[PDB]
Write a protein that binds this ligand. Structure first.
Ligand SMILES: Cc1cc2nc3c(=O)[nH]c(=O)nc-3n(C[C@H](O)[C@H](O)[C@H](O)COP(=O)(O)O)c2cc1C
Ligand SMILES: Cc1cc2nc3c(=O)[nH]c(=O)nc-3n(C[C@H](O)[C@H](O)[C@H](O)COP(=O)(O)O)c2cc1C
Ligand SMILES: [Cl-]
Ligand SMILES: [Cl-]
Lengths: 248, 248
């Protein structure tokens, strides 16, 4: 069907026209996001739509100079949100902050926000729009919270750049099915692991050779390890706790 | 748009027929899940397809006796996976074990797994199948990791029950748009908060009154307050660290 074709056709779009999203398109994207399943009906997230040129610019800089954060149809910031729940309880004369600060609630809010974001992404892609997630905002969350004026119990997780593509780019191959999908138990067989990872590394190296006309030939395992041990964002261990999450 | 109609039509399905998913349907669902965006191309997740009757039964018990975990077309378990990355590093003489233990990588893997799960959910719903996320497996993760034989740096997050619906249930109203969506900065205005929460509380109380015919009239505030005061899964603060996540 058309939905599965749209899902499988996905690629990140990093080049957009200057055509802004309409209020109707933004409305549809937000409603689509909200329609996602939510743990215990908590809906533990918020979406900040950034259209202010100065704020889009600041976020682009904080994200590591990503121009598709400024130049797009709209920039959405997905947040883990337990502030709604804190304030909801204060209205009833209750002061429940300690209950919102454990690892369980941090997992709940991150998963809720991510399911909503992926619904927005599929909805945007079905309309012929392009998307790109922006985790780069996590380089400087203290400054991002100042740009967005987010209160305590609110954690920006990533942005989502949405717009009319100026360049369609191309699809990136995913891990072989047998690396990701396991039947009944997790497959720890070393021979199986080496065979799948060798095959994938060759697929990726060939992909870069083809895409760059021989200019790049890196494997997936070399690429992922190179970037993992770079800007590790260790400050988040304490910073998330400062915002009221994942404590103890 | 058909995709958007499917997204907006979502409701959790908790009653399935005994018709199992075909190998082709499972293949399509897995490929759909893999097609989601992934932070730095890391694909930090694994999907365990549980078809073994004894394992589906154990997981339904561990999830708090949820029969739709056992009786469905297939039961998928979504895991945060940094074991793939640890093993790739080991086979190259690199050491990233400490970085895979930080908050940043825990967020990366939780988000990657959730985006994949929501792609699978939309793909399943577009085929006329029903889905239900199962976070209940987090009640006893030590026993869940034994059922699934997951190694270190692998964390089961939630299950996803997929199948042919035996009962279509009904939609649950979501928060008003103004409660979740903010323009440029987070809206902390108390009057705005009270007005939106009062409106939602009435929508929800009216919803339950119609759904149960006057026998249930709780507001969304009542329901969140009672959820918050529940038996907390506090053990996860230490348990996730035991699996090599969020050690910090
Ligand atoms: C991560 C996650 C975990 C969930 N875990 C469970 C569960 O264990 N049992 C269950 O019956 N529903 C579960 N749900 C379903 C939610 O209860 C449901 O999405 C919420 O009540 C909104 O209802 P709706 O999906 O029908 O719109 C979960 C949803 C999410 C997103
Ligand atoms: C949570 C998240 C954060 C991301 N952050 C960024 C980012 O800051 N900049 C960027 O250019 N791409 C970003 N991406 C896009 C990934 O790089 C991209 O999804 C991966 O390379 C696979 O490529 P594809 O999306 O084109 O299939 C992110 C993706 C996710 C899921
Ligand atoms: Cl990132
Ligand atoms: Cl749950």
């Amino acid at each position: 069907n058309n939905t599965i074709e749209t899902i499988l056709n996905h690629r990140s779009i990093r080049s957009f026209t200057d055509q802004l999203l309409t209020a109707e398109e933004i409305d549809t994207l937000v409603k689509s996001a909200q329609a996602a399943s939510t743990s215990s009906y908590v809906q533990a997230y918020s979406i900040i739509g950034v259209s202010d040129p100065e704020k889009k610019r600041e976020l682009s800089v904080l994200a590591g100079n990503q121009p598709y954060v400024e130049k797009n149809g709209h920039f959405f910031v997905f947040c883990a949100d337990l502030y709604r729940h804190q304030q909801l309880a204060e209205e009833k004369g209750e002061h429940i902050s300690e209950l919102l600060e454990n690892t369980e609630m941090f997992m709940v809010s991150l998963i809720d926000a991510a399911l909503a974001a992926q619904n927005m992404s599929i909805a945007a892609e079905s309309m012929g729009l392009g998307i790109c997630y922006i985790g780069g905002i996590r380089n400087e969350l203290d400054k991002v919270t100042e740009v967005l004026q987010t209160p305590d119990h609110v954690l920006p997780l990533f942005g989502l750049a949405v717009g009319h593509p100026a360049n369609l780019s191309g699809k990136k191959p995913r891990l072989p099915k047998q690396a990701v999908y396991h039947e009944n138990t997790y497959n720890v067989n070393t021979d199986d692991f080496r065979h799948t990872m060798n095959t994938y590394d060759k697929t990726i190296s060939d992909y870069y050779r083809e895409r760059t006309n021989g200019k790049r030939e890196e494997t997936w395992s070399d690429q992922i390890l190179n970037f993992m041990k770079q800007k590790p964002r260790t400050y988040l261990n304490d910073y998330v706790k400062e915002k009221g999450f994942n404590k103890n």
